[PDB]
Design a protein around this ligand. Structure first.
Ligand SMILES: N[C@@H](Cc1c[nH]c[nH+]1)C(=O)O
Ligand SMILES: N[C@@H](Cc1c[nH]c[nH+]1)C(=O)O
Ligand SMILES: [Mg+2]
Ligand SMILES: [Mg+2]
Ligand SMILES: [Mg+2]
Ligand SMILES: [Mg+2]
Ligand SMILES: [Mg+2]
Ligand SMILES: [Mg+2]
Lengths: 296, 296
């Protein structure tokens, strides 16, 4: 299978006076490239996929693709939807605009059965010829892609090569790689990056790397080299910021941290997301103080 | 406040060869009207809102509006979204196409904060001049509209008149009506229709009424007339079917039952929804046996 693994960043989408700040977006991607990231995920959850227009999503993917041209960094475009015809459309769209692969979140809100998730992802995978990474996040979607469904999709569909797991369930991570050790398990939960990698996971799709790309890159590469002592040390150092970045729903804290670091011009979100409380603003600012944040 | 209350039906959307069966839709709505329903909800969750196109939603709303002309029955159109700009647009769309009010589900997947939910619904309510019913269903959305936020919205926004509660939490229902007894609490969970109504709730937005509209209307109207004994008796009779209609994610069981009863032509869903398991198919058919299902 063709794969996209390693240290990856779920990119924030900066807004300026209500519009995508395209220069800021390109600069942030260059900063990620220059700090050792192996792939960027435009218009994922952290990128406020739900509230971007088709035209804004096209712009973001094209900027990611153009900025990564001539480097080793891959573009793994968010393309999921809770309507299968839409998810197929978004997959084809991402491929046509140059993406190296797609991240495709489990349908949210309408709670399909396992049979339905199987047919959903089978349809998407048959629609394009680029790698497909499943994305399980039951706390946001209301459903879970079971281990058996993930394993059947990996075994039956040529482009489906693994899953980004954001379920806080290390037992599921064991179940997955004990029964299907050829899949790429990708951490979708920064606080437990090291435990997932040490069980044979092969990458992270990170929120914290927006702010500390160098640290998340090193963590992941140490771990892939089986320098587990060094990878755990970084994971442990990162725990406080990894947790504070979810004091409110992601990406509210990470955008706040990026703004406080001077990495984006404006602290703007698209409704229904909005600025954090004053208390959480101060807690994010305080936890940031112990970390060395890279500039441009 | 202008309100829409009483016995209401979350309409299934029948498909035939992948398209909305318009005739069937009109015929099902006339059947609801003839069996005492007070309002119909086109294109809600039970109507597979997530997977219908804009043209299909317009069609369903207009068929509902046209079928209710000349009757007391109101059209409370599903218009929610997890993007505030899209939810505002869908509310305007619903009003433009003849709806008497809108049902607006809490943003799913992106998990806004209470502050963001307040701003979300404030924008929607200021965009139209028709009643707005909030809709809380945390098991599908991943977030909860708190009691305090619901009460602030009801007090601050002229058009927001209550909430459809589908949270399986009668404590919340008490909390709401104990602190704000003027709002319209609407049951969004058939099995507990009578407990919600007996606590001062003023209607239901039902799944079961698709199949058994006479029994749900009678239940609701007995309760509103303070004939609690009669209302509870029908609630108790309905318990088995109210539960089996959630053996798989709604609307998979209700459409299956409608098909088994001959009320729709084809057991079709839009991916990612799909037919139930054979076992569940048999369970639904078995539970139906004790009930009298009205025809056309
Ligand atoms: N807001 C809807 C549709 C959409 C996605 N992106 C922009 N709009 C969703 O989250 O699925
Ligand atoms: N599927 C997306 C957008 C959509 C609604 N209906 C059709 N498409 C959602 O659930 O918000
Ligand atoms: Mg690598
Ligand atoms: Mg390359
Ligand atoms: Mg949930
Ligand atoms: Mg198989
Ligand atoms: Mg090495
Ligand atoms: Mg009472």
């Amino acid at each position: 299978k063709n794969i996209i693994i390693g240290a990856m960043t779920a990119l924030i989408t900066p807004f300026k006076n209500g519009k995508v700040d395209e220069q800021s977006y390109a600069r942030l991607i260059k900063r990620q490239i220059e700090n050792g990231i192996d792939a960027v995920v435009p218009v994922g959850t952290t990128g406020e996929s739900a509230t971007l227009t088709h035209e804004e999503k096209r712009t973001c993917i094209e900027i990611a693709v153009e900025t990564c041209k001539g480097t080793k960094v891959k573009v793994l475009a968010g393309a999921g939807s809770n309507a299968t015809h839409e998810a197929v459309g978004l997959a084809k769209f991402a491929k046509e605009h140059g993406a190296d692969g797609i991240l495709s979140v489990a349908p949210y809100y309408n709670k399909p059965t396992q049979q339905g998730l199987y047919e959903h992802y089978k349809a998407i995978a048959q629609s394009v010829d680029i790698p497909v990474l499943l994305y399980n996040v039951p706390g946001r979607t209301g459903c879970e892609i079971s281990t058996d469904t993930i394993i059947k999709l990996f075994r039956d569909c040529e482009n489906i090569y693994g899953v980004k797991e954001a379920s806080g369930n290390i037992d599921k991570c064991v179940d997955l790689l004990a029964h299907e050790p050829r899949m790429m398990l990708i951490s979708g939960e920064d606080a437990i990056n090291y435990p997932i990698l040490s069980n044979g996971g092969k990458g992270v799709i990170s929120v914290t790397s927006n702010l500390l790309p160098d640290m998340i890159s090193a963590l992941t590469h140490f771990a892939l080299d089986e320098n587990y002592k060094e990878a755990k040390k970084i994971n442990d150092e990162l725990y406080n910021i990894n947790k504070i970045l979810f004091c409110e729903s992601n990406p509210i804290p990470i955008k706040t941290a990026m703004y406080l670091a001077g990495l984006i011009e404006s602290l703007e979100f698209r409704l229904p997301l909005c600025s954090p409380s004053k208390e959480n603003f101060a807690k994010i600012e305080e936890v940031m103080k112990k970390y060395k944040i890279k500039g441009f």
